[PDB]
Amino acid sequence: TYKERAATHPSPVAAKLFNIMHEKQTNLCASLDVRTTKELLELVEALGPKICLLKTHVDILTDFSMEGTVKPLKALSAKYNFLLFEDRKFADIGNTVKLQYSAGVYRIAEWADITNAHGVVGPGIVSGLKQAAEEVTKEPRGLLMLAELSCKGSLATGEYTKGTVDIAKSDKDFVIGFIAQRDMGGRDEGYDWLIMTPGVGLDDKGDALGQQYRTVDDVVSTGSDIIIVGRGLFAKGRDAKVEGERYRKAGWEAYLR
Amino acid sequence: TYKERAATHPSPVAAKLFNIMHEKQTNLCASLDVRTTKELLELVEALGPKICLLKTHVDILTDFSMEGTVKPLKALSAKYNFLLFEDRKFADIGNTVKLQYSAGVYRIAEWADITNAHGVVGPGIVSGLKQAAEEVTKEPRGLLMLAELSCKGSLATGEYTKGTVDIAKSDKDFVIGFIAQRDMGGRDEGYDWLIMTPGVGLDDKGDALGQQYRTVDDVVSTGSDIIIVGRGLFAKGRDAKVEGERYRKAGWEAYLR
Numbered sequence: 289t290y291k292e293r294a295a296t297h298p299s300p301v302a303a304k305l306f307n308i309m310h311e312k313q314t315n316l317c318a319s320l321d322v323r324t325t326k327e328l329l330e331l332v333e334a335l336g337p338k339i340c341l342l343k344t345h346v347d348i349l350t351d352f353s354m355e356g357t358v359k360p361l362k363a364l365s366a367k368y369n370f371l372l373f374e375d376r377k378f379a380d381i382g383n384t385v386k387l388q389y390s391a392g393v394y395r396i397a398e399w400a401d402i403t404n405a406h407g408v409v410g411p412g413i414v415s416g417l418k419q420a421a422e423e424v425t426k427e428p429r430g431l432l433m434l435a436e437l438s439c440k441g442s443l444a445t446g447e448y449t450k451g452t453v454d455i456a457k458s459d460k461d462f463v464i465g466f467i468a469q470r471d472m473g474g475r476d477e478g479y480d481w482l483i484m485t486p487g488v489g490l491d492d493k494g495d496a497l498g499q500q501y502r503t504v505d506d507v508v509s510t511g512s513d514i515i516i517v518g519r520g521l522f523a524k525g526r527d528a529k530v531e532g533e534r535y536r537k538a539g540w541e542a543y544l545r
Numbered sequence: 546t547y548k549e550r551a552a553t554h555p556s557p558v559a560a561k562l563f564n565i566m567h568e569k570q571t572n573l574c575a576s577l578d579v580r581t582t583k584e585l586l587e588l589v590e591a592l593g594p595k596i597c598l599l600k601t602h603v604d605i606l607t608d609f610s611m612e613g614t615v616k617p618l619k620a621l622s623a624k625y626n627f628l629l630f631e632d633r634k635f636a637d638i639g640n641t642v643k644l645q646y647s648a649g650v651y652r653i654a655e656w657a658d659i660t661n662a663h664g665v666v667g668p669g670i671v672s673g674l675k676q677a678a679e680e681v682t683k684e685p686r687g688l689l690m691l692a693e694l695s696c697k698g699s700l701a702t703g704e705y706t707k708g709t710v711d712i713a714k715s716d717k718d719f720v721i722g723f724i725a726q727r728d729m730g731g732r733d734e735g736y737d738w739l740i741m742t743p744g745v746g747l748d749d750k751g752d753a754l755g756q757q758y759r760t761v762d763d764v765v766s767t768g769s770d771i772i773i774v775g776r777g778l779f780a781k782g783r784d785a786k787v788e789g790e791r792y793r794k795a796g797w798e799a800y801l802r
């Protein structure tokens with residue numbers, strides 16, 4: 289169970305997340321990909337009590353600022369009890385990602401509990417991101433490797449996926465799991481990887497740019513620990529609060545089954 | 546020759562770049578990866594006369610701004626005659642990259658002549674980026690696919706590289722070439738791909754985070770059209786202006802051979 293995994297997971301970030309999921313009876317991660325901080329904060333407020341994690345793309349915000357975007361996000365995170373996951377998908381050499389994660393305008397390492405990286409770069413990407421994390425904050429940080437993607441024509445399969453899983457094995461305390469479409473095993477080698485799965489929608493089938501959706505029951509059935517839902521919650525005139533409860537209920541019941 | 550390829554290339558961006566390389570006798574691309582706009586502008590000024598392209602990571606700048614960073618960069622670009630390449634390495638689903646490329650704080654599509662993307666996502670990444678480019682500006686834009694990386698343990702090989710090359714084949718006018726470590730062929734299929742190669746250094750062997758360097762003569766001999774040099778130009782107390790001429794000379798002579 290999530291509660292049991294919280295006590296045995298080497299990562300304090302994964303542990304806190306598992307506890308949040310148990311306490312709030314939710315394995316839903318909201319991906320409120322809107323372009324203004326104002327709307328983002330309104331949506332986060334509406335989804336707050338129903339999520340365990342908020343996945344953000346701060347780089348699609350036309351008005352990002354540390355004081356106006358990050359501080360309010362941290363306040364909501366504390367108020368409603370959910371972690372912050374900046375979906376930056378780092379994918380450059382170690383030295384460059386260290387610079388991109390630690391500072392710049394977004395100063396991601398300062399506030400995001402979790403972030404992610406593509407395995408394409410090799411082991412150096414993990415080393416670079418961790419060095420950045422330790423140089424900027426004393427707060428625990430977690431990293432997810434991108435093992436698979438939900439988009440049409442994805443190349444994150446076969447040997448590439450295996451190579452990405454190998455990269456993840458280098459740091460059990462820092463690399464907490466994967467963004468993937470199925471279980472990645474690892475139990476046999478002392479790994480308890482969190483499996484977070486995007487490309488989840490109960491209504492949409494996909495979009496005009498390669499996105500593909502699978503149902504909640506479907507992904508949970510293949511090993512997903514957390515469902516990441518974006519447009520299924522807030523787009524096309526949908527009521528985020530209502531969709532939030534709807535998806536939380538579906539994800540939690542699937543987990544219980 | 547570069548001059549000949551400028552007349553036959555389907556991309557007006559590649560065409561302009563080839564003409565610049567011929568007129569200035571340079572195939573050097575500077576990667577002045579510093580953290581302040583002030584230092585960046587000083588370095589670009591010093592390298593201007595010796596480069597055909599400026600590769601930037603605006604997301605490592607602690608003080609980025611359209612008026613204070615981009616405007617000056619465009620002015621230097623016009624003053625010294627070189628193009629702008631924002632090395633953002635897009636690697637998300639089509640819908641997300643469209644948003645990340647067209648707006649946010651960096652508004653990359655508004656000023657960068659060239660940008661790049663990882664093939665891991667599938668063909669949707671090219672569609673999303675092109676749609677973003679056309680909705681934001683009428684100026685011609687070019688895209689480079691990341692076929693290979695210079696870092697240790699890179700997974701950008703074999704089947705993954707092939708899949709990335711296939712994605713590039715979808716748009717001859719927009720996808721101008723690759724970031725790669727060797728020739729990618731394509732001539733038999735009617736492609737004249739620009740090969741830009743990072744991980745180039747005449748002195749450094751590598752760094753502490755997986756970077757590996759090859760000499761100018763070595764990469765040009767394997768098919769590189771443009772050499773991308775960062776720390777070899779400005780780091781470790783080096784005199785950027787002097788290194789600029791040194792690398793330009795080396796790259797041009799290797800090309801002439």
Ligand SMILES: O=c1cnn([C@@H]2O[C@H](COP(=O)(O)O)[C@@H](O)[C@H]2O)c(=O)[nH]1
Nearest residue numbers: 319437438486487517518519520637641
């Ligand atoms: O395999 C995938 C697919 N999508 N995403 C991200 O998850 C969200 C999916 O949103 P959607 O439900 O609106 O399609 C977007 O932010 C997208 O960048 C991933 O991280 N990986």
Ligand SMILES: O=c1cnn([C@@H]2O[C@H](COP(=O)(O)O)[C@@H](O)[C@H]2O)c(=O)[nH]1
Nearest residue numbers: 380381384576694695743774775776777
């Ligand atoms: O295969 C590679 C390796 N590095 N880079 C980028 O090129 C530059 C190389 O810089 P360096 O010469 O200082 O190592 C950096 O900006 C790095 O992000 C790439 O695009 N691809």
